[PDB]
Structures are given as structure tokens and as C-alpha cells.
Scaffold this motif. Structure first.
Motif, PDB file in Angstrom:
ATOM      1  N   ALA A   1       0.847  -1.194   0.000  1.00  0.00           N
ATOM      2  CA  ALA A   1       0.000   0.000   0.000  1.00  0.00           C
ATOM      3  C   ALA A   1       0.883   1.245   0.000  1.00  0.00           C
ATOM      4  CB  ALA A   1      -0.939   0.011   1.195  1.00  0.00           C
ATOM      5  N   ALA A   2       0.361   2.340  -0.534  1.00  0.00           N
ATOM      6  CA  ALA A   2       1.120   3.581  -0.594  1.00  0.00           C
ATOM      7  C   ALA A   2       0.524   4.609   0.351  1.00  0.00           C
ATOM      8  CB  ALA A   2       1.172   4.103  -2.034  1.00  0.00           C
ATOM      9  N   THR A   3       1.269   4.927   1.410  1.00  0.00           N
ATOM     10  CA  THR A   3       0.853   5.902   2.409  1.00  0.00           C
ATOM     11  C   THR A   3       2.077   6.573   3.017  1.00  0.00           C
ATOM     12  OG1 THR A   3      -0.812   4.212   3.081  1.00  0.00           O
ATOM     13  CG2 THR A   3      -0.820   6.297   4.296  1.00  0.00           C
ATOM     14  N   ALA A   4       2.147   7.894   2.884  1.00  0.00           N
ATOM     15  CA  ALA A   4       3.165   8.687   3.548  1.00  0.00           C
ATOM     16  C   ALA A   4       2.584   9.284   4.820  1.00  0.00           C
ATOM     17  CB  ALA A   4       3.665   9.789   2.617  1.00  0.00           C
ATOM     18  N   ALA A   5       3.458   9.682   5.745  1.00  0.00           N
ATOM     19  CA  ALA A   5       3.058  10.373   6.962  1.00  0.00           C
ATOM     20  C   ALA A   5       2.229  11.615   6.641  1.00  0.00           C
ATOM     21  CB  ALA A   5       4.268  10.763   7.778  1.00  0.00           C
ATOM     22  N   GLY A   6       2.563  12.274   5.529  1.00  0.00           N
ATOM     23  CA  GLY A   6       1.849  13.480   5.108  1.00  0.00           C
ATOM     24  C   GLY A   6       0.635  13.252   4.216  1.00  0.00           C
ATOM     25  N   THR A   7       0.330  11.990   3.905  1.00  0.00           N
ATOM     26  CA  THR A   7      -0.901  11.644   3.191  1.00  0.00           C
ATOM     27  C   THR A   7      -2.078  11.998   4.103  1.00  0.00           C
ATOM     28  OG1 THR A   7       0.147   9.826   1.925  1.00  0.00           O
ATOM     29  CG2 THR A   7      -2.258   9.794   2.089  1.00  0.00           C
ATOM     30  N   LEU A   8      -3.091  12.643   3.528  1.00  0.00           N
ATOM     31  CA  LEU A   8      -4.273  13.071   4.281  1.00  0.00           C
ATOM     32  C   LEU A   8      -5.376  12.014   4.281  1.00  0.00           C
ATOM     33  CD1 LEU A   8      -4.650  16.864   3.232  1.00  0.00           C
ATOM     34  CD2 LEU A   8      -3.286  15.902   5.110  1.00  0.00           C
ATOM     35  N   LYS A   9      -6.057  11.879   5.417  1.00  0.00           N
ATOM     36  CA  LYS A   9      -7.237  11.017   5.523  1.00  0.00           C
ATOM     37  C   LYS A   9      -8.484  11.831   5.174  1.00  0.00           C
ATOM     38  CE  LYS A   9      -5.467   9.847  10.030  1.00  0.00           C
ATOM     39  NZ  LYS A   9      -5.920   9.403  11.368  1.00  0.00           N
ATOM     40  N   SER A  10      -9.654  11.232   5.409  1.00  0.00           N
ATOM     41  CA  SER A  10     -10.948  11.865   5.135  1.00  0.00           C
ATOM     42  C   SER A  10     -11.151  13.154   5.929  1.00  0.00           C
ATOM     43  CB  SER A  10     -12.094  10.888   5.413  1.00  0.00           C
ATOM     44  OG  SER A  10     -11.836   9.617   4.836  1.00  0.00           O
TER      45      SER A  10
ATOM     46  N   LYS B   1      -3.271  14.296   8.951  1.00  0.00           N
ATOM     47  CA  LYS B   1      -2.166  13.446   8.501  1.00  0.00           C
ATOM     48  C   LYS B   1      -2.220  12.055   9.130  1.00  0.00           C
ATOM     49  CE  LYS B   1       1.208  17.195   7.911  1.00  0.00           C
ATOM     50  NZ  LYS B   1       2.429  17.800   8.517  1.00  0.00           N
ATOM     51  N   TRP B   2      -1.785  11.045   8.375  1.00  0.00           N
ATOM     52  CA  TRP B   2      -1.589   9.699   8.927  1.00  0.00           C
ATOM     53  C   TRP B   2      -0.498   9.686   9.997  1.00  0.00           C
ATOM     54  CZ3 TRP B   2      -4.662   5.579   8.540  1.00  0.00           C
ATOM     55  CH2 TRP B   2      -5.582   5.529   7.478  1.00  0.00           C
ATOM     56  N   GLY B   3       0.585  10.420   9.746  1.00  0.00           N
ATOM     57  CA  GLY B   3       1.745  10.414  10.626  1.00  0.00           C
ATOM     58  C   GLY B   3       2.597   9.193  10.330  1.00  0.00           C
ATOM     59  N   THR B   4       3.800   9.167  10.895  1.00  0.00           N
ATOM     60  CA  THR B   4       4.770   8.103  10.659  1.00  0.00           C
ATOM     61  C   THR B   4       4.237   6.722  11.060  1.00  0.00           C
ATOM     62  OG1 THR B   4       6.653   9.634  10.868  1.00  0.00           O
ATOM     63  CG2 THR B   4       7.104   7.266  11.063  1.00  0.00           C
ATOM     64  N   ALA B   5       3.894   6.551  12.336  1.00  0.00           N
ATOM     65  CA  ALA B   5       3.271   5.310  12.803  1.00  0.00           C
ATOM     66  C   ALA B   5       2.055   4.953  11.948  1.00  0.00           C
ATOM     67  CB  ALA B   5       2.901   5.422  14.279  1.00  0.00           C
ATOM     68  N   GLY B   6       1.181   5.935  11.719  1.00  0.00           N
ATOM     69  CA  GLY B   6      -0.026   5.733  10.915  1.00  0.00           C
ATOM     70  C   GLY B   6       0.164   5.394   9.446  1.00  0.00           C
ATOM     71  N   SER B   7       1.362   5.647   8.917  1.00  0.00           N
ATOM     72  CA  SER B   7       1.657   5.407   7.497  1.00  0.00           C
ATOM     73  C   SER B   7       1.886   3.938   7.141  1.00  0.00           C
ATOM     74  CB  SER B   7       2.877   6.214   7.077  1.00  0.00           C
ATOM     75  OG  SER B   7       4.061   5.664   7.640  1.00  0.00           O
ATOM     76  N   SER B   8       2.087   3.102   8.156  1.00  0.00           N
ATOM     77  CA  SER B   8       2.525   1.722   7.937  1.00  0.00           C
ATOM     78  C   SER B   8       1.572   0.825   7.129  1.00  0.00           C
ATOM     79  CB  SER B   8       2.875   1.062   9.266  1.00  0.00           C
ATOM     80  OG  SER B   8       3.514  -0.183   9.014  1.00  0.00           O
ATOM     81  N   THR B   9       2.137   0.069   6.188  1.00  0.00           N
ATOM     82  CA  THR B   9       1.365  -0.913   5.423  1.00  0.00           C
ATOM     83  C   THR B   9       0.901  -2.048   6.341  1.00  0.00           C
ATOM     84  OG1 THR B   9       2.451  -0.415   3.297  1.00  0.00           O
ATOM     85  CG2 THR B   9       1.412  -2.581   3.505  1.00  0.00           C
ATOM     86  N   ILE B  10       1.827  -2.584   7.132  1.00  0.00           N
ATOM     87  CA  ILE B  10       1.500  -3.621   8.115  1.00  0.00           C
ATOM     88  C   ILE B  10       1.934  -3.175   9.502  1.00  0.00           C
ATOM     89  CG2 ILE B  10       2.019  -5.999   8.896  1.00  0.00           C
ATOM     90  CD1 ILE B  10       1.886  -6.907   6.024  1.00  0.00           C
TER      91      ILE B  10
END
Ligand SMILES: O=C(O)[C@H]1O[C@H](O[C@@H]2[C@H](O)[C@@H](O)[C@@H](O[C@@H]3[C@H](O)[C@@H](O)[C@@H](O[C@@H]4[C@H](O)[C@@H](O)[C@@H](O[C@@H]5[C@H](O)[C@@H](O)[C@@H](O[C@@H]6[C@H](O)[C@@H](O)[C@@H](O)O[C@@H]6C(=O)O)O[C@@H]5C(=O)O)O[C@@H]4C(=O)O)O[C@@H]3C(=O)O)O[C@@H]2C(=O)O)[C@H](O)[C@@H](O)[C@H]1O
Length: 342
Positions: free
Chosen positions: A69-78, A82-91
Motif C-alpha cells: 500500500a502507498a501511504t506517507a506520513a503526510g498523506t491526508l485522511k478523510s 495526517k496519517w503520521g509516521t506510525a499511521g503510514s505503515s502498510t502492516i
């Protein structure tokens, strides 16, 4: 008697197989009995947070069985946050006695494409950490055999308990193995990636950024491995072995870089190509809001019998004695846990 409790595949004409890995996990009976899932070759575009203890994934092949999956810490949710570093993880591993064998876990965030974007491009992300695998404080005794971890910045986040990576591939740029966990890596390829955005003469990255608490005996321990460049275009002396991550932490007197996160990274009997220049420092913000530098000589950064062109012995590269090296056996690093596959 290595039988599987569930099989995941891309073919519907496979039999009684699950289409997604999430659906196979879902089929597991509640509790802590061992559950083993075979994941057939294919690219599975899923993000997973493991909360069931004693769960075991086995891919058909490391090359062909992929969780991405593609998710950066700076990717925005709904909600636009921000997802944040911890939140960016694929697994994310938030249970005990997890294992994964013969599979690949990626974060597909396209860091180079992001960096190539014009500075005025509103879609260009600044928070570029994008974690492939995150082992959390709830994920003690996590075992990865013949597993490939793919990313750029912050590929592998290891926190809390003990993890073991065996016959593995891990790729990245900046701080691609990071965190405060006890993480042992044996017979791994650690692959430093090319950076198109970094000028000649500047640093392309750092293999490790340990945040190991000073009172913790073991941090990041790397044994019988190979520290390699992704390509010939990765310049000589462009990568650090580690820099000291002192995470922003909330204390009674404010929120700032943890003074006691004095990280450990130890390399034993590991080959290093000449992209390696040595150790480095890292900056944070102190209790007063000032810049503070954390220096490698103040951190637990050691080598034992490194070899290959990147293996210099100097004052700036401290070496273990033979007697000190005996403290870094698998038995000692992992204590009462012997990693085993189902
Ligand atoms: O207790 C909890 O569990 C906790 O969990 C959350 O938190 C975590 C973490 O615990 C928090 O402390 C915090 O972490 C921040 C960040 O998310 C994390 O990845 C890490 O970041 C490192 C640096 O501190 C960052 O500044 C950043 O590094 C930059 C660049 O991005 C990087 O490319 C590089 O740059 C080069 C050169 O090396 C530089 O000299 C310069 O020339 O620029 C170039 C370049 O741009 O190419 O290095 C710089 C740099 O050193 O500053 O990324 C670093 C990294 O490891 O990738 O630590 C941060 C911090 O300590 O503040 O947030 C984490 C999170 O998950 O969000 C919760 O949020 C928290 O409430 C709590 O619950």
C-alpha cells in the motif's frame, strides 16, 4: 505436518481460497491458538493491523507474494488530518508471536516522484516517511524469515519488544531501520537506495536511527549480513550506519527530544560496500525549544569484524572486543524467546 488453516489466492478457480488476506485472517477462530495462512503469489493491495496473537503468514515466494500500500506520513485522511509516521505503515503488528515467511511487504509511496515535484505543487508531500512494517510495543516476539521490506524513508519501525529478521531484504534511504525495540537481523541484505534529489557530496541516508532507551540492554543488532548499494549510482561515502534518534516525547516539563533515548546499533561480521562513511549525528528540539545535536560518540554505536570497502576501523568507528562480541549472540539478544515457525 505444515498444513494451512486458510489459503489466499488471486484465482477464484483455486478452490476454497480467500480473495484477500484480511478475509483469511477474519476466518481465524477467536483466541490464541496458532493460525497459519498461505498467501499465494500476487500483489495484495491491503493495509493490515494484526491484533490476534499467534498469527502466521506464509507467502508462496518472497519474489511473488506481495503485501503493498502507498501511504506517507503526510498523506491526508478523510478528516483532512495526517496519517503520521506510525499511521503510514502498510502492516502494523500489535499482537504477540506473529511470524511472516517468504513474502514481501512494501510501502509504495513514490518518494522520488514526490521529490521531483515542483516546490509550488500543492500535492508535494513534506512529511515523506512511509513505513512498510511497524512492530509495536504490543508486538513482542515477532519473527520474519525470508521476508523483503520495501520503502524509502522509515521503511522499518521497530518498537517495544523483541523482533527477529532472518534471511531478509530491507531497502530504504533515510532511517530505514528505526525505533526503540530489540531487533536482531541475521543474514540480511540491507539495501541503500539511490537518491536523485540529493546533490553530489551530500548525505543520501542512514541505515539505522535507534531510539533505544539507555536502560535497555539491546537495540538494533545486525549479524552476518550484507550492507549493499541498490545500484552503482549510489555514491561512495553517501550513507551513515546510524544516527541517534531521540524521539519527541511528552514529559512533565514539556514535549521534546527524549534525553534518555540513547540508541544502540551494533554490526557484527557484516560486509559493507563503500557507500558507507561511518556514523553520524542527529538533531532534535530540547526542553527550551532550542536545536540540540545528538552525537554518535555519545551513542551505543559499535562494529565487530566488519569487512568490505565500507569497513574502516578508526577512532570514530568503535570496535567490540571478542569478549564484548560474545554478548551479541542470538540467545543473549532475544533472551528466553527462540524464534520458531509453525
Ligand atoms: O509515544 C508514542 O508512541 C508516540 O507516537 C507518535 O510518534 C512518533 C514518534 O515517537 C514521535 O517522537 C514523532 O516523531 C517524528 C517523526 O514522525 C519521526 O519519523 C522521526 O523523524 C525524524 C526527524 O526527527 C524528522 O525531522 C525527519 O527528518 C528530516 C528529513 O525528513 C530527513 O530526510 C533527513 O534529511 C536530510 C539531512 O539529513 C538533513 O540534515 C537536511 O540537510 O535535510 C536532508 C533532506 O531533507 O534530505 O533528516 C531530517 C532531520 O534530521 O530532521 O524524519 C526523521 C525520520 O526518522 O524519518 O522523529 C520525529 C520526532 O522525533 O519528532 O512522531 C512519530 C509519529 O508516528 O508521528 C505520536 O505522534 C505521539 O503522540 C506518541 O503517541
Amino acid at each position: 505436518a505444515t498444513t494451512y488453516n486458510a489459503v489466499v489466492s488471486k484465482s477464484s478457480s483455486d478452490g476454497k481460497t480467500f480473495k484477500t488476506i484480511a478475509d483469511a485472517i477474519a476466518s481465524a477462530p477467536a483466541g490464541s491458538t496458532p493460525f497459519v495462512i498461505l498467501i499465494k503469489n500476487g500483489v495484495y493491495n491491503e493495509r493490515l493491523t494484526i491484533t490476534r496473537n499467534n498469527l502466521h503468514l506464509k507467502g508462496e515466494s518472497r519474489n511473488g507474494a506481495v503485501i503493498a500500500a502507498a501511504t506517507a506520513a503526510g498523506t491526508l485522511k478523510s478528516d483532512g488530518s495526517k496519517w503520521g509516521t506510525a499511521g503510514s505503515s502498510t502492516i502494523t503488528i500489535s499482537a504477540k508471536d506473529f511470524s511472516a515467511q517468504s513474502l514481501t511487504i512494501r510501502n509504495d509511496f513514490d518518494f522520488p516522484a514526490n521529490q521531483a515535484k515542483s516546490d509550488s505543487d500543492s500535492s508535494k508531500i513534506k512529511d515523506t516517511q512511509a513505513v512498510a512494517l511497524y512492530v509495536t510495543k504490543s508486538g513482542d516476539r515477532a519473527y520474519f524469515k525470508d521476508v523483503s521490506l520495501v520503502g524509502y524513508q522509515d521503511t522499518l519501525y521497530v518498537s517495544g519488544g523483541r523482533s527477529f529478521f532472518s534471511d531478509c531484504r530491507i531497502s530504504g534511504t533515510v532511517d530505514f531501520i528505526f525505533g526503540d525495540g530489540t531487533a536482531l537481523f541475521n543474514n540480511c541484505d540491507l539495501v541503500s537506495r539511490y537518491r536523485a534529489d540529493v546533490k553530489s557530496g551530500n548525505v543520501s541516508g542512514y541505515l539505522t536511527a535507534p531510539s533505544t532507551n539507555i536502560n535497555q540492554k539491546y537495540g538494533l543488532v545486525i549479524t552476518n549480513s550484507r550492507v549493499i548499494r541498490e545500484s552503482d549510482s549510489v555514491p561512495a561515502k553517501s550513507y551513515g550506519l546510524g544516527r541517534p534518534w531521540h524521539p519527541t516525547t511528552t514529559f512533565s516539563d514539556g514535549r521534546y527530544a527524549d534525553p534518555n533515548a540513547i540508541g544502540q546499533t551494533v554490526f557484527l561480521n557484516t560486509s559493507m560496500d563503500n557507500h558507507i562513511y561511518g556514523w553520524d549525528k542527529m538533531s532534535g528540539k530540547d526542553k527550551n525549544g532550542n536545536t540540540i545535536w545528538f552525537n554518535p560518540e555519545d551513542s551505543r554505536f559499535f562494529e565487530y569484524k566488519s569487512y568490505g570497502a565500507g569497513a574502516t576501523v578508526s577512532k570514530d568507528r568503535r570496535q567490540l572486543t571478542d569478549a564484548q562480541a560474545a554478548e551479541y549472540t542470538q540467545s543473549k539478544v532475544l533472551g528466553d524467546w527462540t524464534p520458531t515457525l509453525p
